[PDB]
Amino acid sequence: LIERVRTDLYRIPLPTRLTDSTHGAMMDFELITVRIEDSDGATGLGYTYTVNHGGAAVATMVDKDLRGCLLGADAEQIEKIWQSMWWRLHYAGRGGHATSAISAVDIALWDLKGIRARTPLWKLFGGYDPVVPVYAGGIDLELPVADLKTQADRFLAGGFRAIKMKVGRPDLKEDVDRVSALREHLGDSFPLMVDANMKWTVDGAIRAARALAPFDLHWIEEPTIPDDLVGNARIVRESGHTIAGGENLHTLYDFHNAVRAGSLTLPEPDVSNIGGYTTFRKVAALAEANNMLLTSHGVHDLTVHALASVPHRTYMEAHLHAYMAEPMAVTDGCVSAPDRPGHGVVLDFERLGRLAV
């Protein structure tokens, strides 16, 4: 039984003005943490985030809407609780910010079950390989070419052996020069992927694909908006590239629609908005049945457990490490999921209070 539910909202400012083709200027993201305590004193940690806005909304959803489905409920019945939450925020929801709220709670619940069973999540899930390959995702669209190469250098220095840069400049010519620059800087066999962050039109995306073909990019992420199934399927049929998407899909059905329609070739769910580990693994299954690999977006410290428990995973995005007790370190291109009970992530809530809103 759940006896306590603490929801907290923090505004974590960023070290650099990270920027892209649509989200604009990221100067601070909103962190929402959820701590669930059972009748035995154990406390599971869960959390999600937004960029610039929507944070207070998510936190309010957990604190005012979901709480009533948690207090007094058996915390070991996660699937049961998930459905009850899905239905509580269904009216006017069924997607949107409500899924982020749910994801945070869901993550907390699994953390709790992992602690109780005295075993890491990647094992609780079944367990494949705790060593997960990674890549660094820069939010460098406005970063000058030279600064691009520099950042590239630090990523390498930091153990990363695969990099993703932003694209979607007004003039495709500028993207072609920058991508060309890093392909020469990084070298022929270096895994380099791009993310247009929904910036292109269907025709534009395909046009950009022909132009970037020479550089053998590992993949193109979110060429256009995610909602257009027909357009994305067209971009898949015509761009001769791996098409990654999923960070903006928020339900199992969105992934199901995309996969069935073939509007993406590489599923990229975000455990913190897809519905937690619960829905993430379901999406993972969908991918496996469709003979596709599986990558991820955000909170890799939490995500490492999911990918360590699936056989078809590939380069995980591992761009808050300051507030963490023992954050994972990247070695020769990979990370290792810890073996502590649960997900093993511990946040310095004392130092965080400094940033509460």
Catalytic site residue from 113, 164, 166, 250:
166
Q: Is the Cβ of residue 157 or residue 289 nearer to a copy of itself in the bound state?
A: 289
83 Cβ neighbours under 8 A, 6+ residues apart = none
Q: Given the rule CB under 8 A, which of 10-18, 131-139, 148-156, 255-263 is the region that contacts a copy of itself?
A: 255-263
Q: Does 50 bind a copy of itself (CB under 8 A)?
A: yes
Among 331, 273, 264, CA closest to 297: 273
Work out how close the CB of 77 gets to a copy of itself at its nearest, in angstroms, rounded to a whole number. 4
Beta bridge partners of 26: 18
Q: How far is the CB of 39 from a copy of itself (least distance, A)?
A: 15
Catalytic annotation on 149?
no
Confirm or reject binding of residue 137 to a copy of itself (CB under 8 A): no
Find out whether 288 and 259 touch, Cβ atoms under 8 Å.
Answer: no
Looking only at residues 146 through 205 of this chain, which bind a copy of itself when binding is defined by CB under 8 A?
171, 173, 188-189, 201-203
Tell me: is residue 221 an annotated ligand-binding position.
yes
Instruction: Tell me how far apart the alpha carbons of residues 318 and 151 are, in angstroms, rounded to a whole number.
Output: 15
Pick from 47, 155, 160, 255 the residue near a copy of itself by CB under 8 A: 255
Nearest Cα residue to 251 out of 89, 90, 82, 94: 94
Tokens of 279: 């829905």
Sign, CA dihedral 327-332-334-340, equals: negative
Q: Quote the least distance from Cβ 350 to a copy of itself, whole Å.
A: 26
Residue of the chain from 195, 254, 270, 301 that contacts Mg ion (CB under 5 A): 195
- The residue assigned the tokens 């610039």 is 52
Contact set for a copy of itself, span 20-49 (CB under 8 A): 22-23, 48
Find the helix or strand (DSSP H, E) in which 149 lies. Answer: helix 145-157
Query: Is 166 tagged catalytic?
Result: yes
d(CA 173, CA 260): 34
Binding site as annotated, residues for Mg(2+):
195, 221, 247
Catalytic positions, please? 166, 297
